[PDB]
């Protein structure tokens, strides 16, 4: 059947779906079963959507609402054609905190750290992930969301990843690396991508990058994925970490070359990342531009550490103050307008390097802080920095 709430109508739900209003704009609907029943047997009172480049700018948030007598929670809302990004949902029996129908800018940054810690993703909709906001999240597409290079038409790959632990001794921990290559033989480039765990097994980047070479808008290459461990290691080795960049050259890089050729010309090296895993791409480059010739950086956080708009990163200022040099890099640098207080943080680079500023593809694209949007940039920023390779 399809009575609204019935177990053969909640199979019918595979997450949000959405209706055209005109050229610009859709109307989607959310919903969410609630594990507890009706409102009767339930002891959630409020469930909020976050949509990560959304629910964020707007000023005071509204709940889901509860089809009496149903385990049914809807909502709705509008999104531009092209719109992509994740939302995820936050159940919760607490309904305090956004109690006062204003708010505040202060008030909200609040209210929604409060509540995050207990976001789900959607668990109707299959794509789903841990987020960049480190709070996990699900996909969604508006039909005329921008071509992302590759992810349209996906091919299996003809050899698989080999997943290996490599077992730093300087970092002194262990981590999962995977190798995957995309051609047999002949001088392939190295491209090292950061949050490997996430581009292996998140979104496993596999048959995209496949497919973009299959088309040769990619030169058979070697990747090498490294497992962030988890965030408080992610947060220390990321960023302008030294050990972290001597560990993989020293360690790490003559491991693969054994296992997997790869060109020794910096020119044509990738290292790729994005927030964290972006500014970590950079500061490699800047301090290793003899093994490091190209940085793709989505979304870099290059406040870092000083969140927010108190004081310029200290990459910024390390650069400010003449000290390490650009020196010889070519590099994609990206982030989108709606994330936005990254995007004041990469203007500010940008400017910072006035010297490069001739080898240096700079994007502002309509994404959020946002694995949804990142994907396409990264698979866009490996064709650009290879463009060379087809002289």
Same mark, same amino acid.
């Given at each position: 059947?399809?009575?609204?709430?019935?177990?053969?109508?909640?199979? /019918?739900?595979?997450?949000?779906?959405?209706?055209?209003?005109?050229?610009?704009?859709?109307?989607?609907? $959310?919903?969410?079963?609630?594990?507890?029943?009706?409102?009767?047997?339930?002891?959630?009172?409020?469930?909020?959507?976050?949509?990560?480049?959304?629910?964020?700018?707007?000023?005071?948030? %509204?709940?889901?609402?509860?089809?009496?007598?149903? @385990?049914?929670?809807?909502?709705?809302?509008?999104?531009?054609?092209?719109?992509?990004?994740?939302?995820?949902?936050?159940?919760?029996?607490? &309904? @305090?905190?956004?109690?006062?129908?204003?708010?505040?800018?202060?008030? *909200?940054?609040?209210?929604?750290?409060?509540?995050?810690?207990?976001?789900?993703?959607?668990?109707?909709?299959?794509?789903?992930?841990?987020? #960049?906001? #480190?709070?996990?999240?699900? !996909?969604?597409?508006?039909?005329?969301?921008?071509?992302?290079?590759?992810?349209?038409?996906?091919?299996?790959?003809?050899?698989?990843?080999?997943?290996?632990?490599?077992?730093?001794?300087?970092?002194?921990?262990?981590?999962?690396?995977?190798?995957?290559?995309?051609? &047999? +033989?002949?001088?392939?480039?190295?491209?090292?991508?950061? @949050?490997?765990? $996430?581009?292996?097994? /998140?979104?496993?980047?596999?048959?995209?990058?496949?497919?973009?070479?299959?088309?040769?808008?990619?030169?058979?290459?070697?990747?090498?994925?490294?497992?962030?461990?988890?965030?408080?290691?992610?947060?220390?080795?990321?960023?302008?970490? !030294?050990?972290?960049?001597? !560990?993989?050259?020293?360690? *790490?890089?003559?491991?693969?070359? +054994?296992?997997?050729?790869?060109?020794?010309?910096?020119?044509?090296?990738?290292?790729?990342?994005?927030?964290? #895993?972006?500014?970590?791409?950079?500061?490699?480059? *800047?301090?290793?531009?003899?093994?490091?010739?190209? +940085?793709?950086?989505?979304?870099? /956080?290059?406040?870092?550490?000083?969140?927010?708009?108190? %004081?310029?990163?200290?990459?910024?200022?390390?650069?400010? !103050?003449?000290?390490?040099?650009?020196?010889?890099?070519?590099?994609?640098?990206?982030?989108?307008?709606?994330?936005?207080?990254?995007?004041?943080?990469?203007?500010?680079?940008?400017?910072?390097?006035?010297?490069?500023?001739? /080898?240096?593809?700079?994007?502002?694209? &309509?994404?959020?802080? &946002?694995?949804?949007?990142?994907?396409?940039?990264?698979?866009?920023? *490996?064709?650009?920095?290879?463009?060379?390779?087809?002289?």
């Amino acid at each position: 059947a399809l009575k609204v709430g019935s177990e053969s109508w909640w199979q /019918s739900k595979h997450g949000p779906e959405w209706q055209r209003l005109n050229d610009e704009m859709f109307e989607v609907t $959310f919903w969410w079963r609630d594990p507890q029943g009706s409102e009767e047997y339930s002891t959630i009172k409020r469930v909020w959507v976050y949509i990560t480049g959304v629910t964020d700018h707007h000023q005071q948030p %509204q709940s889901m609402q509860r089809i009496a007598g149903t @385990d049914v929670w809807q909502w709705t809302t509008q999104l531009n054609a092209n719109w992509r990004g994740s939302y995820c949902f936050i159940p919760t029996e607490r &309904d @305090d905190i956004f109690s006062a129908p204003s708010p505040d800018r202060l008030e *909200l940054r609040e209210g929604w750290r409060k509540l995050l810690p207990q976001a789900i993703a959607d668990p109707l909709n299959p794509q789903s992930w841990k987020g #960049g906001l #480190g709070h996990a999240v699900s !996909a969604l597409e508006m039909p005329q969301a921008p071509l992302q290079p590759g992810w349209d038409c996906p091919q299996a790959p003809e050899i698989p990843a080999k997943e290996i632990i490599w077992k730093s001794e300087r970092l002194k921990n262990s981590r999962r690396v995977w190798i995957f290559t995309t051609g &047999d +033989v002949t001088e392939r480039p190295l491209a090292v991508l950061l @949050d490997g765990e $996430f581009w292996a097994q /998140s979104m496993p980047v596999w048959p995209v990058l496949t497919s973009l070479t299959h088309r040769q808008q990619l030169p058979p290459a070697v990747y090498v994925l490294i497992d962030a461990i988890d965030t408080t290691h992610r947060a220390h080795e990321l960023p302008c970490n !030294a050990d972290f960049w001597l !560990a993989v050259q020293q360690e *790490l890089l003559p491991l693969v070359k +054994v296992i997997a050729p790869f060109s020794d010309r910096a020119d044509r090296t990738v290292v790729a990342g994005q927030s964290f #895993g972006g500014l970590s791409a950079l500061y490699a480059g *800047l301090h290793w531009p003899e093994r490091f010739g190209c +940085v793709l950086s989505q979304s870099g /956080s290059y406040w870092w550490p000083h969140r927010g708009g108190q %004081q310029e990163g200290v990459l910024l200022e390390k650069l400010k !103050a003449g000290e390490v040099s650009a020196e010889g890099l070519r590099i994609v640098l990206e982030a989108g307008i709606r994330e936005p207080m990254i995007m004041r943080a990469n203007q500010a680079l940008y400017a910072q390097l006035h010297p490069i500023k001739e /080898s240096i593809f700079w994007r502002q694209v &309509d994404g959020g802080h &946002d694995a949804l949007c990142w994907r396409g940039g990264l698979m866009q920023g *490996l064709i650009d920095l290879w463009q060379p390779l087809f002289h």
